[PDB]
C-alpha cells in the first residue's frame, strides 16, 4: 500500500483578539488512507463540541478534512490539535500560534 | 446532477 | 471567470465489520453543496449550501437513488479489485472516483474528466477526447476492454459534455451571490525576531474566494523561493480561504524584500513591503 502522513495547520477563522469569540480550526490534509483521529485541546483537555467537513480529496487522491469549534481566545488559555493516523508512531500535537 | 453511467471493473 | 462542477466519491471496506463506508461530496468551484454518508441516519442526498435547498423533491429523490447506485458500484468494484490484484478478504482497501466538467468565462464546455484510483493509486481515467481510456496497469487494461466493448466513454461524454454543463450553469444562476462573487484577498505583513542576526516576514492573504491564489516573494524585484515557507491554502469554514508565505531575512535587510499577491478578485496585483 501507499501511506501518506497528514500535514497539519492550527489556526483561527479570524485574526484572534483576546475577549472576542472566534472559531479554532485544525486543517489536516495530504493523508492516506481515509481513517484519521483528530481532537481540539484546551489547556490539554479534549473539547467535546467539535464538528468537521465531509471527507473529500485532492488532485493526487490524498484526503483532507477541517475540524473546528467555537472558542473565545485569551492571553492565558492554550490550544492544540491531537491528530493520530496509521502513519504516526505517536499522535502529533501542533500548538495554536495566532501568527501575531 | 449526479451522472447515471454505472459500469464496473 | 472559468468554473467547474465535480463529484468526489470515497468507498472504504471494513472486511467483515459491516459494509464499506461510502462518502460522496459535490462541489461548484470551491463551494460544496451536496453530501451522502453511508452511516448517516438520513440515507438521503443532502444540502450543504443554501442555494441548492430551493430545488424540489424529485431533484432530491433522484439524487439519492443515483448516489446509492454509485455506492453499490463501488461496493462491487472492491470485491472485483481484490480478485484482479489477488488480495485477501483480511484487509481494508479504498476506491475513489472523481468526475466533472469545466466551463469558460463564456460558460461553454471547456473540459470533462472521469478519474478512478485504488488504494490511493491511479487505476483508470477517461482521456481528454472523452473517446478513450488511460490504464494504470494490466488490471485496468481488462477493465478498459470491458468499457470499450460496452460503449462507456460515449455514455460518459453525453453526461459531461451535456448535462454537467447545463446543471453547473443552473447552479451558477441560483447561487449567484455565493458562486459568482470574487472576494479579494485582504492582505497584511508581520515581523518576528527569530535570532540575533535574522527575522521572519510573514505575508498574509485572508477572507478570499475562490481558493486559487499566488503568493510570491521578491528581493530587489527578483523572485526568492529559497529561505521561504509557504503554507497550503486552507479554509476558515465560512467558505473563504487563507494563505501565507514567509522568508527568513538578515536583520536590517528587510526594506529590500516585497511579497506579491495575485487573485481574480484583485484588479491589479498587490505588493507589500516592511516598514
Which residue is listed with cell 536590517? C252
User: Distance (Å) from the C-alpha of residue C7 to the closest C-alpha of chain A?
Assistant: 9
Beta strands of chain A (E only): which ranges?
Answer: 7-12, 22-31, 37-42, 45-46, 51-52, 56-57, 63-71, 79-84, 92-95
Which conformational region is residue C146 in: left (phi greater than 0), alpha (psi within -120 to 50 degrees), or beta? alpha
Q: What is the 8-class DSSP label of residue C120?
A: T
Domain count, chain A: 1
CA atoms C230, C233, C235, C240: torsion sign: positive
Which residue is listed with cell 497539519? A8
State whether A100 and C8 contact (CB < 8 Å): no
Burial call C162-175: b when 16+ CB within 10 Å, e when fewer:
eebbebbeebbebb
User: Distance (Å) from the C-alpha of residue C25 to the closest C-alpha of chain A?
Assistant: 7
User: Distance (Å) from the C-alpha of residue C110 to the closest C-alpha of chain A?
Assistant: 18
Alpha carbon A98 to its chain centroid, in Å, reads 14
Chain C residues whose beta carbon lies within 8 Å of the beta carbon of residue A30 = 232
The alpha helices in chain A, defined as continuous H runs, are none
Beta-carbon count within 10 A of A92 CB: 16
Beta-carbon count within 10 A of C40 CB: 11
Strand order in the sheet with C222-223: C222-223, C214-219, C257-262, C270-272
Resolution of the experimental model, in Å, one decimal: 2.7
HEC sequence for C212-260: CCEEEEEECCEECCCCEEECCCCECCCCCEEEEEEEEEECCHHHHEEEE
C-alpha gyration radius of chain B: 8
Q: Which domain holds residue A82?
A: 1-100
The method recorded for this entry reads X-ray
Chain C residues whose beta carbon lies within 8 Å of the beta carbon of residue A7 = 232
**Chain B to chain C Cβ contacts (< 8 Å):** 51
Amino acid at each position: 500500500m501507499i501511506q501518506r502522513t497528514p500535514k497539519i495547520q492550527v489556526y483561527s477563522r479570524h485574526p484572534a483578539e483576546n475577549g472576542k469569540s472566534n472559531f479554532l480550526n485544525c486543517y489536516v490534509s495530504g493523508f492516506h488512507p481515509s481513517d484519521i483521529e483528530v481532537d481540539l485541546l484546551k489547556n490539554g483537555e479534549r473539547i467535546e463540541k467539535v464538528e468537521h467537513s465531509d471527507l473529500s480529496f485532492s488532485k493526487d487522491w490524498s484526503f483532507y478534512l477541517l475540524y473546528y469549534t467555537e472558542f473565545t481566545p485569551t492571553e492565558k488559555d492554550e490550544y492544540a490539535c491531537r491528530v493520530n493516523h496509521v502513519t504516526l508512531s505517536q499522535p502529533k500535537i501542533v500548538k495554536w500560534d495566532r501568527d501575531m | 446532477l449526479l451522472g447515471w453511467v454505472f459500469a464496473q471493473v | 471567470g472559468s468554473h467547474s462542477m465535480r463529484y468526489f466519491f470515497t468507498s472504504v471496506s471494513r472486511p467483515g465489520r459491516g459494509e464499506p463506508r461510502f462518502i460522496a461530496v459535490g462541489y461548484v468551484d470551491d463551494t460544496q453543496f451536496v453530501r451522502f454518508d453511508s452511516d448517516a441516519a438520513s440515507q438521503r442526498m443532502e444540502p450543504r449550501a443554501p442555494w441548492i435547498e430551493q430545488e424540489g423533491p424529485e431533484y432530491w429523490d433522484g439524487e439519492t437513488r443515483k448516489v446509492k447506485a454509485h455506492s453499490q458500484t463501488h461496493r462491487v468494484d472492491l470485491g472485483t479489485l481484490r480478485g484482479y490484484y489477488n488480495q485477501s478478504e483480511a484487509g481494508s482497501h479504498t476506491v475513489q472516483r472523481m468526475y466533472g466538467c469545466d466551463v469558460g468565462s463564456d460558460w461553454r464546455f471547456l473540459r470533462g474528466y472521469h478519474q478512478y484510483a485504488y488504494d490511493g493509486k491511479d487505476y483508470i481515467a477517461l482521456k481528454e477526447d472523452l473517446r478513450s481510456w488511460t490504464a494504470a496497469d494490466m488490471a485496468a487494461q481488462t477493465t478498459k476492454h470491458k468499457w470499450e466493448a460496452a460503449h462507456v466513454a460515449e455514455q460518459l461524454r453525453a453526461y459531461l459534455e451535456g448535462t454537467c454543463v447545463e446543471w453547473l450553469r443552473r447552479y451558477l444562476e441560483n447561487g449567484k451571490e455565493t458562486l459568482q462573487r470574487t472576494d479579494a484577498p485582504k492582505t497584511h505583513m508581520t515581523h518576528h525576531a527569530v535570532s540575533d542576526h535574522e527575522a521572519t516576514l510573514r505575508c498574509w492573504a485572508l477572507s478570499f474566494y475562490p481558493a486559487e491564489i499566488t503568493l510570491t516573494w521578491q528581493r530587489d524585484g527578483e523572485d526568492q523561493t529559497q529561505d521561504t515557507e509557504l503554507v497550503e491554502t486552507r479554509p476558515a469554514g465560512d467558505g473563504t480561504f487563507q494563505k501565507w508565505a514567509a522568508v527568513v531575512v538578515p536583520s536590517g535587510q528587510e526594506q529590500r524584500y516585497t511579497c506579491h499577491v495575485q487573485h481574480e478578485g484583485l484588479p491589479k496585483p498587490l505588493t507589500l513591503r516592511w516598514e
